[PDB]
Nucleic acid binder design. Structure first.
Ligand SMILES: [Mg+2]
Ligand SMILES: [Mg+2]
Ligand SMILES: [Mg+2]
Ligand SMILES: [Mg+2]
Ligand SMILES: [Mg+2]
Ligand SMILES: [Mg+2]
Ligand SMILES: [Mg+2]
Ligand SMILES: [Mg+2]
Ligand SMILES: [Mg+2]
Ligand SMILES: [Mg+2]
Ligand SMILES: [Mg+2]
Ligand SMILES: [Mg+2]
Ligand SMILES: [Mg+2]
Ligand SMILES: [Mg+2]
Ligand SMILES: [Mg+2]
Ligand SMILES: [Mg+2]
Ligand SMILES: [Mg+2]
Ligand SMILES: [Mg+2]
Ligand SMILES: [Mg+2]
Ligand SMILES: [Mg+2]
Ligand SMILES: [Mg+2]
Ligand SMILES: [Mg+2]
Ligand SMILES: [Mg+2]
Ligand SMILES: [Mg+2]
Ligand SMILES: [Mg+2]
Ligand SMILES: [Mg+2]
Ligand SMILES: [Mg+2]
Ligand SMILES: [Mg+2]
Ligand SMILES: [Mg+2]
Ligand SMILES: [Mg+2]
Ligand SMILES: [Mg+2]
Ligand SMILES: [Mg+2]
Lengths: 169, 145, 211, 159, 296
RNA sequence: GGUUGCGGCCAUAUCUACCAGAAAGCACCGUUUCCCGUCCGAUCAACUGUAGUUAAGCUGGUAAGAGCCUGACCGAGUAGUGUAGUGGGUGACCAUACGCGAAACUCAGGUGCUGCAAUCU
RNA sequence: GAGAACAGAAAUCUCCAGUAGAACAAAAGGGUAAAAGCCCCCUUGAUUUUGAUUUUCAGUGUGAAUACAAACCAUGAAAGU
RNA sequence: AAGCUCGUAUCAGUUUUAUGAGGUAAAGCGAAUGAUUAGAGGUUCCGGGGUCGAAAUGACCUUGACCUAUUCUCAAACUUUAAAUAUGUAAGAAGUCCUUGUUACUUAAUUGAACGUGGACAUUUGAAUGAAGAGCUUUUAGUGGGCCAUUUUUGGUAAGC
């Protein structure tokens, strides 16, 4: 059947991987602040590469999760950029999906040469009502198969509202 | 060694009676390669008691040879004759312990025939002398007594 | 410079195999264990004949390789390099030590000298399958290997169908009926347990209960 | 050189039992002890505070003192040619009650009955434990049951 | 699950299940170990727990001993017992928590003799205090908060229960800093605000702050109130007179039933399937190999 | 009998694929003024019990299911072992005597029991 | 395992599986999953008094440890530790 | 050696029954870890080679790795199971049961803990066997190079090592 086994978006998490720290980061940070509203979160390096020019614990990048209303806003506004056509690859077999765009300008937002230009990894995670159970504390159980967000049941939802294209094989 | 001590078999060719239960059948188990034994007849229980049968009275091995000795000591348990003893042995009485303890371990001489075997310290079944040879113990005893 | 085998024949010491403790140990002279048409099917060779030991002793790795060689060499050139499957059911896993030589006989603990395999009594060393039309050609093989070895060991006709667990007729029953299905160079059998699903997927040939 | 620590050699002694790791079940604590009870000693490997020394593993003594998280147990250990009295302060996880005594207790209270239930009757009791008596006779019929006669088999191989 | 996840035979074999009341995500044993267990020289002295749960709306207050056969409820009062005294709306709110706590406090203590002595605070400006032991004669009843899995945050309603069990004459040891109006940046309490939260003076000011800035929302939630004509203000008496109603008679009245146990027994075995005998199970397979196999 | 809060034993309770579930209870679920916590009211805190839902959680049933639990003169009185001999054998090793006696395998049967309190056609 | 600009085997973001296959200074072996591991919070019980106990044992010492008593404290809503 | 206090008394290199503890031998490896022979079946946008190719996140061969179900062989420093011999405790008068006092400990509480007062049931009073008895004290000798045999077993090719 089909009652409240709908399909909302769990959250939307943009992320700017920056091969360094400093001015270059805070900018990428700033960028994601004005874009999202919520003050963003930074991420330290996980170890040391030396051929990526990093040292462990270096504050390498930033990102931000946003859910509900304001999400779909920035989902569409960036789905705009990707001209509503993705790839069959882009969809996790566990139900979610994401994409990348260069230039944060391509989706509102001015230029300001004191901030520069950045890219974003746009990643959309779906889920259904009763997402809860597998994230609350008391009786943390696991949601049954006939409910688990799947790749098919997600391209289908995507193919519809947004009226965007799938592409590829 | 202890078990031989407990069954009062402290020297060679000396012999006793043993009431059979788990808790002694297991004792006998433990000492197969050192004793020979089996089921005594009526015939030889009499002769054991009659000829080399003695009673322990204030340690002191007192040789029986008159019914007054026995009544004097086993009389409290019934038992007032040298044959009353034998009864209380051969039948296992309500007083086998007191009955049997009373008689000093028997002192049998070497077999008058010979052990019949060529080497003693094998099992009966294996053509030796030790271990339980069932009623074949009467021919032995009777020749040692 | 290899020490005469008589030195280690008997299992005088507990299993000393190459380990994270051992480590320094050398390579085994017998490194291959299936010779002849080993890729062949169970039906392809019904006859099995064993080389079987009569002693609790140790078998030198070098003695193994050199014996495996002899009895592969013969069997082939006589009956044909595909006329048999020769398996070696014994592995040299037991490291032998030696005390090479100022010092005297203190701190004697040796360093690894060679491997050997530890055989029981009645334990098979070699197992060969063919068709019941090589028998002599096999058996004669094992008899010539016999010499490469210490200890009395003796040849035996297997009551079983080749390398299988199943004796001659009781095998046939499971194949002239439905339960056997090929695999590699051995075989799988129709289990009466578990998922009725894949149980009929595989072995479709069963389930009719005739030929 | 040699090495002889307090928990040495306790590889498999202080382990955990198969698929039995984890937080000790909650009854272990709910058990109550008094000065006098007989207790068996099994060290719980997970429970490092108030453990017992290995020697007392599998040993069994009497509670001589009760404290907050613990019981004082005494044990007759024997050094040299004699026994000394050792006192063990164990935690209530390393100790369980002893069914070596259940036999006895169950036998006195049952010996109470047989005794009373025969005095108010006609004495006639007999309530000491006798060992295993040899079997009295019996007759076995062959009706339905005729003897199947066996011989020893000859030598097969079937490897 | 995907083919490349999937549990091995080995895996399932060498696996050790947690308990059950932990697989169910219901019981924190680590706490239980330290709630349940008694000073080993206090012997059979029960250690009691003030159990405070929250259904998805309906508050649960059980007083409970422990027994190796299975924990023993001395007493139990639920927030859905709060008609009788005077509450029909908001029974998952802080103050119906205070009520239950008080109801739980007064109803046990009663069935435990210390009814007349140990009355706790009757006045309630909610100053910080603990029911103190009396000058000669019976120490109060002592009992510990079994907060369960509830997350200890300063202001949660789990503690409201506690403040009301403390008010109703129970010794239930507690520090103040989880009662609303506990100042963060100074170890210091404002009881003007706790005495608020006790009488629902946060719900009231929510009934008032919507009665003039949005009457759309006020209607949706706060519905039931309108249906009984109770606008804000009067809600402070509602609990005060609840209080009284409880302290006077908390003697627990059960439910009248209607239909017996055995009656419920019948109409439940209706919708209950049953297992199958091996003889049955045999045929099913046999029928399935007639079918699935023989080439249709 | 169900269900819930609290449990004891901690897989006969877990894993995998399906299906079925009244009534109540749980639950998913709505809201953000308040105490509270967050990069994000997802988690946590708070408010309503209203606006909605059996989809999932939860309960049970199905399966020559995996696992697991139990039994057996299934294997096997076998492997191993305590005791004995001026037993065999060049040895390696092995028979015999009085006792104790496994694991694997194989076959069958089983898939939570239940303590307190509250509630329900 | 599957997914996201530059981004590559290796950077960061997400989800699914995950009996511990990790981590807990060190050697190793025990032990640990709403912890004994990882992050955060507040602290000084690594404190004062003097007995008993366990190991090595002579049932001396030393080292190390354990459970109490008498204080003063830390933390937690609390039981507690 | 000297004795001393007692005596049916408590004693035991033994059994029995009841109840613990143990990871050796065996055993296992289509159970974990770690070794090890052999095929078979799958999987790569993806380890490398080759054919067609302008390339392909292209197809086809190819060999490797891994995954699946099988397969021969192992462990002092592996293990699910797990013996035999050995090993802790218990088999009453210092026992069991009723009544109801003491306290400063302890309980919500004369609750509980411990020690008690008053009462109740004798030798089938709580298995076997044995006992030229049992318990206790003081003081001093010699010794503190050892060797051998069966079974367990380490080193060494071995040894009358
Ligand atoms: Mg005698
Ligand atoms: Mg003559
Ligand atoms: Mg003559
Ligand atoms: Mg002669
Ligand atoms: Mg001789
Ligand atoms: Mg004569
Ligand atoms: Mg050696
Ligand atoms: Mg060295
Ligand atoms: Mg030879
Ligand atoms: Mg050492
Ligand atoms: Mg666990
Ligand atoms: Mg007593
Ligand atoms: Mg410590
Ligand atoms: Mg399998
Ligand atoms: Mg907690
Ligand atoms: Mg309903
Ligand atoms: Mg459903
Ligand atoms: Mg639930
Ligand atoms: Mg279920
Ligand atoms: Mg099954
Ligand atoms: Mg990236
Ligand atoms: Mg970290
Ligand atoms: Mg210090
Ligand atoms: Mg030291
Ligand atoms: Mg035993
Ligand atoms: Mg060991
Ligand atoms: Mg072994
Ligand atoms: Mg096994
Ligand atoms: Mg014993
Ligand atoms: Mg010296
Ligand atoms: Mg001296
Ligand atoms: Mg000298």
């Amino acid at each position: 059947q089909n009652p409240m086994r709908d399909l909302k978006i769990e959250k939307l998490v943009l992320n700017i991987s920056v091969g360094e720290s400093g001015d270059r980061l805070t900018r990428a940070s700033k960028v994601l602040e004005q874009l999202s509203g919520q003050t963003p979160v930074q991420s330290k390096a996980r170890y040391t590469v030396r051929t990526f020019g990093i040292r462990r614990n270096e504050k390498i990048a930033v990102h931000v999760t946003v859910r509900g209303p304001k999400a779909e806003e920035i989902l569409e506004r960036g789905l705009k950029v990707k001209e509503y056509q993705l790839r069959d690859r882009n969809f996790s077999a566990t139900g979610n999906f994401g994409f990348g765009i260069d230039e944060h300008i391509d989706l509102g937002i001015k230029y300001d040469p004191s901030i520069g230009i950045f890219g974003m990894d746009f990643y959309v995670v779906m889920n259904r009502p009763g997402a809860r159970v597998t994230r609350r504390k008391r009786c943390k159980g696991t949601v049954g198969n006939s409910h688990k967000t799947t790749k098919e049941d997600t391209v289908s939802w995507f193919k519809q509202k947004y009226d965007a294209d799938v592409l590829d094989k | 060694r202890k078990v031989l001590q407990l069954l009062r078999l402290t020297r060679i060719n000396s012999g006793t009676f043993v009431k059979v239960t788990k808790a002694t059948l297991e004792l006998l188990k433990l000492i197969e390669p050192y004793v020979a034994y089996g089921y005594p007849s009526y015939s030889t229980i009499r002769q054991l008691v009659y000829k080399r049968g003695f009673g322990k009275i204030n340690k002191q091995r007192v040789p029986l040879s008159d019914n007054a000795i026995i009544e004097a000591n086993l009389g409290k348990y019934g038992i007032l004759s040298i044959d009353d003893l034998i009864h209380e042995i051969i039948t296992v009485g309500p007083h086998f312990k007191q009955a049997n303890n009373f008689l000093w371990p028997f002192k049998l001489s070497n077999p008058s025939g010979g052990w019949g075997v060529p080497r003693k310290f094998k099992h009966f079944i294996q053509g030796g002398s030790f271990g339980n040879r069932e009623e074949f113990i009467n021919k032995l005893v009777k020749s040692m007594n | 410079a290899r020490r005469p085998a008589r030195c280690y024949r008997y299992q005088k010491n507990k299993p000393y195999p190459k380990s994270r403790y051992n480590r320094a140990v050398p390579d085994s002279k017998i490194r291959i264990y299936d010779l002849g048409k080993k890729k062949a099917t169970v039906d392809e060779f019904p006859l099995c004949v064993h080389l079987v030991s009569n002693e609790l002793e140790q078998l030198s790795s070098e003695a193994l390789e050199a014996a495996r060689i002899c009895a592969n060499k013969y069997m082939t050139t006589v009956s044909g390099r595909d006329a048999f499957h020769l398996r070696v059911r014994v592995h040299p896993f037991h490291v032998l030590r030696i005390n090479k030589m100022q010092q005297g006989m203190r701190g004697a603990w040796g360093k690894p000298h060679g491997l050997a395999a530890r055989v029981d009594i009645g334990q098979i060393i070699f197992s060969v399958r063919t068709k019941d039309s090589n028998k002599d050609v096999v058996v004669e093989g094992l008899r010539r290997a016999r010499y490469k070895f210490p200890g009395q060991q003796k040849i035996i006709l297997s009551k079983k169908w080749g390398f299988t667990n199943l004796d001659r007729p009781e095998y046939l029953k499971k194949r002239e009926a439905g339960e056997v299905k090929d695999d590699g160079a051995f075989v799988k059998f129709l289990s009466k347990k578990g998922s009725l699903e894949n149980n009929i997927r595989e072995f479709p040939e069963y389930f009719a209960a005739q030929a | 050189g040699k090495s002889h620590g307090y928990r040495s050699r306790t590889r498999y002694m202080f382990q955990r039992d198969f698929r039995k790791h984890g937080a000790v079940h909650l009854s272990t604590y709910l058990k109550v002890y008094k000065v006098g009870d007989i207790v068996d000693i099994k060290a719980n490997g997970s429970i490092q505070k108030g453990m017992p020394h290995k020697f007392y593993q599998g040993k069994t003594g009497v509670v001589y003192n009760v404290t907050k998280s613990s019981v004082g147990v005494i044990i007759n250990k024997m050094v040299g040619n004699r026994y000394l009295e050792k006192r063990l302060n164990l935690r209530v996880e390393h100790i369980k009650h002893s069914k070596c005594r259940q036999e006895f207790l169950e036998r006195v209270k049952a010996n109470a009955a047989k005794r009373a239930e025969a005095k108010a009757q006609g004495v006639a009791v007999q309530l000491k434990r006798q060992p295993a008596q040899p079997r009295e006779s019996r007759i076995v019929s062959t009706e339905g049951n005729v003897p199947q006669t066996l011989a020893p088999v000859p030598y097969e191989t079937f490897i | 699950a995907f083919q490349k996840d999937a549990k091995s035979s080995a895996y399932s074999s060498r696996f050790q299940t947690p308990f059950r009341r932990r697989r169910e995500g219901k019981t924190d044993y680590y706490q239980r170990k330290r709630l349940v267990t008694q000073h080993k020289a206090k012997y059979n002295t029960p250690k009691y727990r003030l159990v405070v749960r929250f259904t998805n709306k309906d508050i649960i207050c059980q007083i409970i001993s422990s027994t190796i056969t299975g924990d023993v409820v001395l007493a139990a009062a639920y927030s859905h017992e709060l008609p009788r005294y005077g509450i029909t709306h908001g029974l998952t709110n802080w103050a119906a928590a205070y009520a239950t706590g008080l109801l739980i406090a007064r109803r046990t203590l009663q069935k435990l003799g210390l009814d007349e002595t140990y009355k706790g605070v009757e006045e309630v400006e909610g100053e910080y205090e603990l029911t103190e032991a009396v000058e000669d004669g019976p120490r109060p009843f002592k009992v510990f908060l079994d907060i369960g899995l509830q997350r200890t945050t300063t202001g949660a309603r789990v503690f409201g229960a506690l403040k009301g069990a403390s008010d109703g004459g129970l010794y239930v040891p507690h520090s103040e800093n989880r009662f609303p109006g506990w100042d963060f940046e100074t170890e210091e309490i404002d009881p003007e605000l706790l005495r608020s939260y006790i009488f629902g003076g946060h719900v009231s000011q929510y009934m008032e702050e919507l009665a003039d800035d949005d009457e759309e929302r006020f209607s949706e939630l706060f519905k039931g109130y309108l249906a009984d004509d109770i606008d804000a203000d009067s809600l402070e008496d509602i609990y005060t007179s609840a209080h009284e109603a409880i302290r006077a008679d908390p003697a627990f009245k059960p439910t009248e039933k209607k239909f017996t146990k055995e009656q419920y027994a019948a109409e439940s075995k209706k919708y209950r399937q049953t297992k199958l005998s091996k003889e049955e199970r045999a045929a099913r397979v046999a029928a399935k190999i007639a079918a699935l196999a023989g080439q249709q």
